[PDB]
Amino acid sequence: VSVALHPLVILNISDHWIRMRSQEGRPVQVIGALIGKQEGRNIEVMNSFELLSHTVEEKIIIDKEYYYTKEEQFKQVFKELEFLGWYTTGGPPDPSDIHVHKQVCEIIESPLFLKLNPMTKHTDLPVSVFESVIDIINGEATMLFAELTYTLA
């Protein structure tokens, strides 16, 4: 096995998470399929879409009917494509992902698993501090910005 990954997949998944967080106000886990082409050993994950599910005791159940109906409904436009595996959002792999993985493992034999962590802290954005300094090179004179080093409480 060896894997390629279009950036559209990663954007698709972020967008799914963002659309969902908005729906409730709080961020929730999202789940979906990985599709694409699989030539030679070049597994090319070309795209993705959303998968329905339902959560109960922190256990997630994939809606199989929804998947097969979509596959049915989309077989003509996804003819050159294949189901490669599934994705979800969050941190390092958890027991719950294995539980979901076994269900995807019932759809295709050895499914890929893509996990994306949409968690970002604002405090990680670049922050530069400057002080103003009036420079006069022999001849030309001006005000410039001179960078300062800073600590964080």
Q: Which residues bind a second copy (CB under 8 A)?
A: 7-8, 11, 14-15, 18-19, 22, 49-50, 52, 63, 66, 70, 73-74, 76-77
22 touches which of Hg ion, a second copy, none (CB within 5 to 8 A by kind)?
Answer: a second copy
105 lies in the site for Hg ion, by CB under 5 A: yes
Closest approach, Cβ 74 to a second copy, in A, equals 6
Single out the residue of 50, 70, 115, 118 in contact with Hg ion (rule: CB under 5 A): 50
7-15, 89-97, 99-107, 125-133 -> range binding Hg ion (CB under 5 A): 99-107
7 touches which of a second copy, Hg ion, none (CB within 5 to 8 A by kind)?
Answer: a second copy
Residue 16: left if φ>0, alpha if ψ -120 to 50, beta else—which one? alpha
Using H for helix, E for strand and C for coil, what is the string for 34-94? EEEEEECCEEEEEEEEECCEEECCCCEEECHHHHHHHHHHHCCCCCCCEEEEEEEECCCCC
Closest approach, Cβ 22 to a second copy, in A, equals 6
Instruction: Determine phi and psi for 48, rounding to 5 degrees.
Output: -155, 165
